[PDB]
Design a binder for this molecule. Structure first.
Ligand code: SF4
Ligand SMILES: [Zn+2]
Ligand SMILES: [Zn+2]
Lengths: 311, 122, 182, 434
């Protein structure tokens, strides 16, 4: 086995014990051969190829090194031959070169942050840590039990920067659920009159729950960065309830909260709005939930839903 | 004028020109007076007079065409408008020797405005 | 192999020919009806749509004139007779010359021509198509930004409409299926 | 996916545009030829065989989502397409065969994707007995269904909407002892449903087909429909891709160098031949000649090339002017239009132009006799397994795919990228990969 196939066969001797695991302490044995075999496991699951136990196409490079070596994007799945890969670029539109196939087995250390900063520059959202690269990666959906570990994916999308001096720096696109190869209250309608009066439900932090029905975006600021969500139950019930979220360890929930879905949360503070008699609740730092006529110049618009495509 | 400098976030110390260049538009069309729209007053308070929800007729103030654009444009409009006959009407139309007439009628002028243009180009 | 469109200038006295919508070269390309060809003169024939209209009809109304009066000509490349009094005998290909009794006879302005020519007209007045078929983004956007008003478009639309309706009036684009599958 | 899937019937007596007529003609013929090719390439159930077709078919306007009664666009296109091509193939058994066989397999595929409820309900709309069981009977009759027939394995039979039948049309599902019986209302998996549908379809379809062929003379009194009167399978392609004056500019010297890696067997061998002989017959050059316009070199340059290859082989340096070079030049003149003013397409170097003794113009894969050709091709340093699997298709008298597999091998790339139809397109590709 010369250097060609030794490229893979060295992962049992150099790669995984050095780049895919924290080298601050001992090189885990639960990870190197486990991924060594799991790659062929998910390969031979379908395995359309000619038959080559070495998936030559993929490797591992720290997340903030693509911008040093692959100054271009990378999006792949498993087992696509060059032809079958060339047989996916139409489903909706081929306008412009399709995402490149710089093929790797995307493995990153999951953290609710990226850098060595914890309070001001907090991102909340889940991003990747490695041994020679620490980057952001665009999520899709969040449950709550994947903080502080390492996760791998054969399906993935990446993007190199525009000007490392400018805003447009690199990132990743995450397609599927977090896959680690490691050996692994006040309902809205049922509490419709609690803070409806100020005299009853102010001061301390109380738990709540309900189905998210009306959620806006999450705004930053100089000091008070937050968002305010609204919830309830099914459609023949027009009343909602509202919570607020203003914590660096809680932007995670605007990254996690979704309409049509329901939640059960604890440790949610009150709101005391200055000069405004509009008391409703917020969350706070120590909380964790789980999943549950010329006047017609100016006129007032209406509201409707849709779901379309970037065009 | 380099693009990013002309497109930086304007302020004395880094002022772009589009910051101001639209000044007559900027001012004659929409003066200020309504305080900020806040999450209390967009997502929370009802009723809210938020501007986005309001849809309003709005006529056209202007546009900044190309120098050449106007040049050829005027050229064409005028040249086409070149009625030979209505230059001199009856009866002296038939009261000149074939020399003096073509002599006196070989020249013309005209001028035009932005007002005749929708919008009022500048 | 059809006959082009010739055109009289209303002011400069010169003549013109209108082959393809665009007038020639690539990024330079310009609409046909824009400027009289003669370099110096600066009149712009577009502003005489209606006059063009006239000639259009006053031209087509001789092509049809030919066909319904269609000549008849001989085939055996020696005989070369020209007449209209259609004789009555017949054979595989059709009728037979009276003199060269060993040969067919052919129409002169074969209908295929007539319809071809009317397509040729309707071609160069319907710029919209040729505009859509154009590849390069920036060329398209720039030219449209330049000089495709509703007005110019509308004038093309007008004359093209005259042509197209005047052929589709009734001759040839139809194929009566109700007699084709009985 | 669309309503389209339907059993052809009732010619739609509208009246339409002549342009749209020939359009639909060409479109549908393209679809047919393609489906045939795509099919003979792979095996049926492979997902290439799906992906590629569901790409092409959707591309040519025949399968989209829900719309109005029948004047939805693609279903109408399918409709008039068929009920025209009906007029195409009414003049052979081989022809009518090929047409049937192809439409058959298409309908099979194009139908195999409908949602199950849509499947059963549209079967209902088709004829009477086309009705479904209640899945309770799956539990009630698992023993009967499974133990009865060997056309099902174990207990894991999926939630297929099995069907009630009259035995009177079960005429092979039961006599072969392949189904349970409830008073002739046997219950059979969907597979044989597709089978029987397709068989009755073939029957009824042929039964209709023969009729028009017995009622031709009408068209004989028109000539607008002269191509499709009897002129489809001939020397026009889909269309003129590798037509006059496409991408290319290369100097003379390089030609030979490129030859060894870029000339489709026909050309390549002819160029070797003229490299040796330096003389050619009356017709021969008139293939190679126009083929050169494929890359499109200038006449005086091409004239110079031919001059070199002429007088070095002792062709009188005065004849050249008033002889060969004369017509070689005219090959870009006034008349030649669609006769000379065009390159050639394999379906002109196959379906006609018989090649005679010791001459070279003409499709090797056709005219070259089998085992002489075996050694001949092998002389291109080819693995004999490829040569064998090639000669197989060659005696299958479908050759374009043979040229294809050859190129596939000699450049080792495991996709043909296209479905070849013209040697110059082959050339433009071979230069693309460089
Ligand atoms: S595809 Fe046709 S023209 Fe090309 S080499 Fe094969 S037989 Fe000859
Ligand atoms: Zn003029
Ligand atoms: Zn005669």
């Amino acid at each position: 086995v010369p250097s060609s196939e030794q490229a893979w066969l060295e992962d049992a001797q150099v790669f995984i014990q050095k780049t895919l695991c924290p080298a601050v302490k001992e090189p885990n044995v639960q990870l190197t051969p486990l991924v060594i075999d799991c790659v062929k496991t998910v390969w031979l699951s379908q395995g359309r190829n000619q038959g080559s136990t070495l998936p030559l196409s993929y490797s591992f490079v720290s997340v903030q090194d693509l911008k040093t070596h692959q100054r271009l994007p990378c999006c792949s799945h498993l087992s696509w031959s060059s032809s079958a890969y060339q047989a996916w670029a139409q489903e909706a539109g081929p306008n412009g070169n399709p995402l490149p196939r710089e093929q790797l087995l995307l493995l990153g250390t999951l953290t609710d942050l990226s850098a060595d900063l914890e309070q001001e520059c907090r991102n909340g959202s889940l991003y990747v840590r490695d041994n020679t690269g620490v980057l952001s990666c665009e999520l899709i959906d969040l449950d709550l039990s994947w903080l502080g570990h390492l996760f791998l994916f054969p399906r993935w999308s990446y993007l190199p920067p525009a000007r490392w001096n400018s805003s447009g720096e690199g990132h990743l696109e995450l397609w599927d659920a977090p896959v680690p190869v490691f050996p692994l209250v006040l309902y809205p309608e049922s509490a419709s009159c609690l803070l409806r009066l100020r005299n009853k439900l102010r001061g301390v932090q109380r738990n709540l729950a309900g189905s998210l029905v009306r959620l806006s975006a999450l705004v930053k600021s100089k000091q008070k960065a937050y968002f305010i969500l609204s919830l309830g139950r099914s459609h023949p019930a027009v009343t909602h309830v509202s919570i607020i979220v203003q914590v660096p360890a809680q932007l995670v929930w605007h990254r996690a909260l979704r309409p049509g879905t329901a939640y059960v949360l604890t440790e949610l503070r009150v709101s005391k709005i200055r000069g405004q008699r509009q008391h409703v609740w917020m969350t706070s730092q120590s909380s964790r939930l789980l999943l549950l006529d010329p006047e017609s110049l100016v006129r007032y618009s209406r509201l409707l839903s849709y779901s379309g495509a970037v065009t | 004028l380099r693009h990013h400098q002309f497109l930086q976030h304007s302020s004395p110390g880094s002022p772009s020109l589009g910051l101001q260049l639209l000044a007559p538009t900027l001012d004659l069309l929409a003066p200020p007076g309504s305080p900020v729209r806040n999450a209390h007053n967009e997502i929370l308070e009802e009723p809210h007079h938020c501007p986005l929800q309001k849809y309003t007729r709005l006529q056209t103030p202007s546009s900044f065409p190309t120098l050449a654009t106007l040049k050829e444009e005027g050229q064409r409009k005028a040249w086409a408008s070149f009625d030979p006959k209505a230059l001199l009407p009856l009866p002296e139309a038939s009261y000149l020797p074939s020399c003096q007439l073509n002599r006196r009628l070989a020249w013309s002028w005209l001028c035009l405005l932005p007002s005749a243009f929708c919008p009022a180009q500048v | 192999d059809c006959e082009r469109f010739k055109c009289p200038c209303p002011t400069c006295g010169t003549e013109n020919i209108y082959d393809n919508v665009f007038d020639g070269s690539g990024t330079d390309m310009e609409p046909s009806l824009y400027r009289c060809s003669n370099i110096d003169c600066k009149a712009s024939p577009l502003t005489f749509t209606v006059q063009l209209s006239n000639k259009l009809i006053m031209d087509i109304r001789r092509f049809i004139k030919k066909y319904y009066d269609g000549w008849l000509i001989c085939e055996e490349p020696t005989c070369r007779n020209r007449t209209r009094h259609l004789p009555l005998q017949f054979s595989r290909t059709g009728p037979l010359c009276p003199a060269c009794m060993k040969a067919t006879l052919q129409p002169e302005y074969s209908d295929k021509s007539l319809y071809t020519q009317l397509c040729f007209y309707r071609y160069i007045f319907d710029a919209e198509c040729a505009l859509e078929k154009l590849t390069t983004d920036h060329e398209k956007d720039k030219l449209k930004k330049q000089f495709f008003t509703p007005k110019v478009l509308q004038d093309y639309r007008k004359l093209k409409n005259t042509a197209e309706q005047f052929l589709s009036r009734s001759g040839y684009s139809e194929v009566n299926l109700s007699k084709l599958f009985a | 996916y669309p309503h389209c899937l339907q059993f052809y019937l009732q010619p739609p007596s509208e009246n339409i545009s002549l342009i749209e007529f020939e359009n639909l003609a060409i479109d549908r013929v393209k679809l047919l030829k393609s489906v045939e090719n795509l099919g003979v390439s792979y095996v049926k159930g492979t997902e290439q065989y799906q992906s590629k077709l569901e790409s092409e078919l959707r591309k040519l306007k025949f399968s989209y989502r829900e719309n109005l009664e029948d004047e939805y666009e693609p279903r109408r296109r399918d409709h008039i397409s068929h009920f025209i091509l009906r007029l195409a193939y009414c003049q052979s058994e081989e022809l009518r065969r090929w047409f049937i066989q192809q439409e058959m397999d298409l309908l099979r595929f194009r139908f195999s994707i409908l949602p199950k409820d849509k499947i059963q309900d549209f079967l209902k709309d088709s004829q009477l007995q086309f009705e479904a069981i209640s899945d309770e009977e799956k539990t009630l009759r698992e023993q009967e269904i499974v133990a009865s027939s060997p056309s099902l394995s174990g207990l894991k039979l999926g939630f297929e909407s099995i069907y009630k039948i009259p035995f009177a049309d079960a005429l092979d599902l039961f006599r072969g002892r392949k189904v349970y019986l409830e008073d002739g209302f046997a219950y059979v998996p969907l597979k044989d449903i597709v089978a029987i549908i397709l068989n009755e379809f073939r029957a009824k379809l042929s039964k209709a087909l023969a009729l028009t062929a017995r009622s031709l003379p009408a068209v004989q009194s028109d000539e607008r429909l002269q191509p499709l009167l009897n002129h489809l399978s001939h020397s026009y392609t889909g269309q003129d891709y590798s037509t006059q004056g496409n991408v290319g500019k290369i100097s003379l010297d390089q030609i030979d160098l490129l030859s060894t890696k870029s000339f489709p067997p026909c050309m390549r061998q002819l160029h070797k031949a003229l490299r040796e002989n330096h003389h050619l017959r009356h017709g021969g050059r008139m293939q190679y000649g126009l083929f050169l316009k494929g890359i499109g070199l200038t006449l005086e340059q091409a004239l110079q090339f031919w001059k070199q290859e002429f007088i070095k082989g002792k062709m009188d340096p005065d004849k050249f002017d008033k002889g060969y070079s004369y017509n070689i030049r005219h090959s870009f003149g006034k008349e030649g239009k669609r006769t000379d003013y065009t390159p050639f397409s394999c379906l002109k170097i196959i379906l006609s132009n018989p090649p005679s003794q010791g001459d070279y113009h003409g499709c090797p894969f056709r005219h070259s006799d089998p085992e002489l050709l075996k050694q001949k091709l092998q002389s291109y340093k080819i693995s004999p397994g490829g040569i064998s699997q090639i000669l197989d298709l060659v005696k299958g008298t479908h050759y374009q795919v043979a040229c294809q597999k050859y190129f596939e091998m000699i450049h080792n790339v495991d996709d043909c990228g296209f479905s070849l139809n013209h040697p110059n397109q082959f050339f433009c590709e071979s230069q693309r990969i460089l």
